[PDB]
Amino acid sequence: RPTLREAVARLAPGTGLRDGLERILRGRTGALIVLGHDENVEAICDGGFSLDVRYAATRLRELCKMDGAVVLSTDGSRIVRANVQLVPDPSIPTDESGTRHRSAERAAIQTGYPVISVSHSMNIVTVYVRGERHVLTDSATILSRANQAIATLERYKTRLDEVSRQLSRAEIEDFVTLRDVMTVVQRLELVRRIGLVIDYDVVELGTDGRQLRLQLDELLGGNDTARELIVRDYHANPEPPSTGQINATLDELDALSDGDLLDFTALAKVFGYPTTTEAQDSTLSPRGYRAMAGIPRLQFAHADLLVRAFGTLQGLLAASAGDLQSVDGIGAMWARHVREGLSQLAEST
Amino acid sequence: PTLREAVARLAPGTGLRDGLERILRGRTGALIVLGHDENVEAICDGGFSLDVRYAATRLRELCKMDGAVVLSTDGSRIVRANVQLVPDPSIPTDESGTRHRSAERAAIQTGYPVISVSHSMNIVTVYVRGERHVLTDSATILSRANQAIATLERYKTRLDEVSRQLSRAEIEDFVTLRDVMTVVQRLELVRRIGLVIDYDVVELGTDGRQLRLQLDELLGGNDTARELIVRDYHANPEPPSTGQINATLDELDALSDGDLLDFTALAKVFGYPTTTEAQDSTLSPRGYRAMAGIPRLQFAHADLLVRAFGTLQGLLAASAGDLQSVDGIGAMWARHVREGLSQLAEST
Amino acid sequence: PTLREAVARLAPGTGLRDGLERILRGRTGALIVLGHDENVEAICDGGFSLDVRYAATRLRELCKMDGAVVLSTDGSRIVRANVQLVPDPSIPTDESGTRHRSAERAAIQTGYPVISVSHSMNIVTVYVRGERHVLTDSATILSRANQAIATLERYKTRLDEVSRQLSRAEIEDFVTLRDVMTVVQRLELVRRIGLVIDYDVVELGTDGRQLRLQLDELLGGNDTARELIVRDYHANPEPPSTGQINATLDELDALSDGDLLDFTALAKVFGYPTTTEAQDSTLSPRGYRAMAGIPRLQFAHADLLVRAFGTLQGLLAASAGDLQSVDGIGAMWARHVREGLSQLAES
Amino acid sequence: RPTLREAVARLAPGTGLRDGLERILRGRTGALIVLGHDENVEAICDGGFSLDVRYAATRLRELCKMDGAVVLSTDGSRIVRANVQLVPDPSIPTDESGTRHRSAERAAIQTGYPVISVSHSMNIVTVYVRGERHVLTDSATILSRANQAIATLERYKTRLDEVSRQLSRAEIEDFVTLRDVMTVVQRLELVRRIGLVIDYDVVELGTDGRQLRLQLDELLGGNDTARELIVRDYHANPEPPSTGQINATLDELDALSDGDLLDFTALAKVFGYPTTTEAQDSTLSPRGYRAMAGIPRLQFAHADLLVRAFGTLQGLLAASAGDLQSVDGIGAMWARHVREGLSQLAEST
């Protein structure tokens, strides 16, 4: 069945449905619309007339001038019933108020399809999707909220970049501590979560979100890769993290509450380090996956064999060119390319 | 309850504010008592007694009826609806109309907040014991507050610029009253706009959560800066007492916005002459600001050094051994202070 | 009075505007006369005579009634309500309808402002002696003004960049007339946008308080910069007198928007020839702008030094002792100026 | 006869017509207005009053209080009929909804003049011109759309500046590649295209767009010159590109689709380089137009003479003041000026 997020996109600006709903609001008639029709919807439909017409925003507005509910086909392409009386099972729980909205949420739960009720008194559109509710919001209000969020994301992007530069500099110096790594982890997560908030606003804005999508893609882009590499570099298990294990760790980070992300001990637990104060002060050593990823055209197969042999970035830097040609599966030309790239880390700082 | 407390109870994100927004869209009007006891019952006439949990939808429906709705003190319950309030007509009020005059009188007599919604004006007014506040749409508040935050970040840049100028002048040993009062004015301007933004943030409720973090970051350190500059350049010859510092800052707040534009007005608060020649006369900081820049240096240590040497220049000429001669300053701290002072001089 | 004075009297935050806002929400319409004398009484017909203190609520309630409300000149009292205005029909007007045509005719005949509120259009119009102004909701003005602020921030950025280029040229001793006038154009462009936004602040009244803080900070120092550039690059060999400086600034304001794009028109205001060949001729700064760049140096001191040495190059080559034998400059300010100048050259 | 874009201009803010339409919307009367009168319009006109009065916003509002349609003269200066019943040929096809709007578009097609319908229920203005339709939008909504675009244009302008500075660094070092040149070409085009979008909003805004016009011209200022200079520097033709050749290249760039702009090989084709991915790594040598433009006070006329004489930026850097004063039209003063201006770039990067 459609999910709450799917319904929100289907009612977003730029869609045929949203054009009809905008028309209904201006007419102040109210409405009750079922986004789907099957045998289950028929069971709760009572009376009304059957019509078979192509969906049109103008047609929807006219039919919703009538008392009752309008039913659309599942694909949303046709209007099949109008002036219908919904009779959903009263035992289905709902916290809505009044016959119209209580009938709407109950019908949404019983049939499994989205149901829209528009209040003539309040000029509000509500969509019910299987026990969840979404209230449409003015595109101006969403834009104002999203642009402030974009402003916060730009600041999160600036602080992320500088703490990231500090971490890399410490990696060369061999003076990285667990707390420093969790400072970068915290900033990557903060960037990700505010990014998700803006993403939901972009979806809700529909065509009115096109420009916001472009801004969001630049600010975020590369956030997923940075989170994956940092888990790959600083995870407590002696074995280099598997790709699936990395996704498990990242999923644990997402499970943390917004408040927990401010707690460096909680993050330390997600990477397998102890939660103690002393653990934060302890010095770590990067595994080196991030450095290899920066080397152009170096397939991860060659990076995993080298990282497994030497273990740490300092071991990779301490290796000679011949030491990088004595690893099984690494060529002579590849050994030269990796050694030169690590020397460019000296060029970095 | 205070008026600001009442405004918080009606702020966005509360059940009450949800109900009031619904009432406004219904254009029904309302007259709501936020509390119930024997005194309220005395002024209640007719109506229904009911015992239901508060809900925005329930409040909207009940206010469709003529009369008033009374809630429990905690706001969790609706206890009566359709009530006729009859507060003592002798209680004075300058409100207009039966509903609003009855609302303010009821607020005064019972001591609880009373809300009246005008169907004609679509305005929410809350009365708390002779004071009034009219709600403002969150949209207007957000736009107004964002200009204020934008201006405040710019005032914060200007404050940093004049502060570095003062520190450089302090090291150079050529500081004039005018240079100090430029910093005093910028500190106060940041503070006052900060207070303005704070009131809007409170009124915004949940819609002010993001703006609150921005405000706390921009302001942070303003109180310490105001205390320190008073402590360094106050006319009183003995270093200012904690009570004197708090008194001066209260006087600075008492000045009008126009007075903050008058450097002579600021100089009077600091105890200096109001003449124009005073703005040009030189002064010497005590050194509290410099010591505060020293990491890990407890204020108690800085106070002993300032009383011994008297001025920042006396501290800068003091050797590390010379700073182990005052009782209460150890050898390690003495090296740490001299090292810090020499670093401070080079930076300017 | 004037139309601008009336708009101030009707600005947000005033008792009058509060009543008008209440009338607009009530959608009753209104016809209000801001003044009472014999000429008004001649035009008043029927109605009730009352003498009450003005309050926004009182104006709203009285304007629910058909007819017109008359206020005292100072605006402190309501003197008539439900009155019929009967201005001389020979008085010409291009307004539409009985109410608005009666409003303008009454404004012309009596000389006081007259306000009409349209129930159909929910628009407030004030008539002052043959002129018309329509009040605008504070939201619309704020949006209009913020667009102007966006332009102003870009113009301030362009002004800062060209100003730093000019100052760098002053140190290099190779400054041309066209360079100076490039800064002159950008200073004027910033000013003109500033004037437009300032007008929106006035109409906004109390709703413009935040826009005033933002506007004053962005403009801040622009008037001072316009004075300093005139003081540095004005034809007259003697440093321009305060009367000459104000005259130059007044001529710039008189220029049309189109003239500002032409540097030769700007050159004329400063007393230089309009020929393009002149735009390539090198100039010598007096040093007012450079001295203004020195932190903490008040213009009293800066002016004494600039008048003594004559040119910025003379200031740069002066020792600390050379800047102490100018009466009015002590040892401390002479040293501070010497160091401040060396910083500019070194950077 | 009026075209769709021309008609929208006649209804733009600041016009007498748009003032009248704004009055109609506030009055909630609805309207049906024909912008033109000839034999064909009269043919479809039925009943009503014939009047000859000058157009005024107020006069239009009052006349539209009556049932029916108002006809204006072709020049728009007069109101010629009111209370008219339009009877367009019903065979003319239309997909509009309702008697008023379907009658409006049919009349627009049959007579060839613009026709305006105002919905009393929806408070929406639609203009029909020969099978095309446009719905007017409140100036606030257009401004909101345009300010989002201005924000993106601010991000593209910053990104353009940084890659341009990177290209400038490479030009001095003589380590430029096609990929470096095409990164700047792409960023120049993105700024240009978003700028064109904002320009259309300025036109639709009429007088309400004057400030947006000032801001837009400031941000876009210099973008055209940058596009010309980069073509002048890195065009595959051996001789410096011709003026018509430059115009041809920029026209091809405009012809590219948005997706093609994301293809560096697509941009390489326009400049005349090979379309292969390998070609992106080939080294290029700039002619020096861009660097000379960075020199203060240097008129392009003189830079064109120097660039054609020496051929490459590296040749210009190696040139002495005497070498730069042997080009006709380059004096001693300008030879010195360019000589120091180039040696300052060499040191800075």
Ligand SMILES: Nc1ncnc2c1ncn2[C@@H]1O[C@@H]2COP(=O)(O)O[C@H]3[C@@H](O)[C@H](n4cnc5c(N)ncnc54)O[C@@H]3COP(=O)(O)O[C@H]2[C@H]1O
């Ligand atoms: N001598 C005349 N010639 C032609 N048409 C006439 C007229 N007198 C009245 N009307 C028409 O009757 C409408 C309603 O007039 P009423 O006196 O009810 O309502 C009036 C009255 O309450 C007030 N108003 C208009 N002119 C006034 C004046 N000179 N003095 C006082 N009140 C005035 O404004 C209301 C609406 O005026 P509006 O012009 O919109 O609407 C006017 C106008 O269209």
Ligand SMILES: Nc1ncnc2c1ncn2[C@@H]1O[C@@H]2COP(=O)(O)O[C@H]3[C@@H](O)[C@H](n4cnc5c(N)ncnc54)O[C@@H]3COP(=O)(O)O[C@H]2[C@H]1O
């Ligand atoms: N032949 C027909 N077939 C089916 N339904 C019909 C019809 N003629 C009228 N109606 C219905 O009656 C409504 C009111 O018609 P009325 O002529 O009063 O009000 C009309 C008339 O004043 C004007 N209008 C519509 N078509 C026109 C035309 N061809 N020429 C001139 N005026 C027109 O616009 C008003 C509103 O039009 P709208 O369609 O919204 O509203 C129409 C439409 O819903």
Ligand SMILES: [Cl-]
């Ligand atoms: Cl629509």
Ligand SMILES: [Cl-]
């Ligand atoms: Cl709501």
Ligand SMILES: [Cl-]
């Ligand atoms: Cl009220």
Ligand SMILES: [Cl-]
């Ligand atoms: Cl109000």
Ligand SMILES: [Cl-]
């Ligand atoms: Cl009359």
Ligand SMILES: [Cl-]
């Ligand atoms: Cl329609």
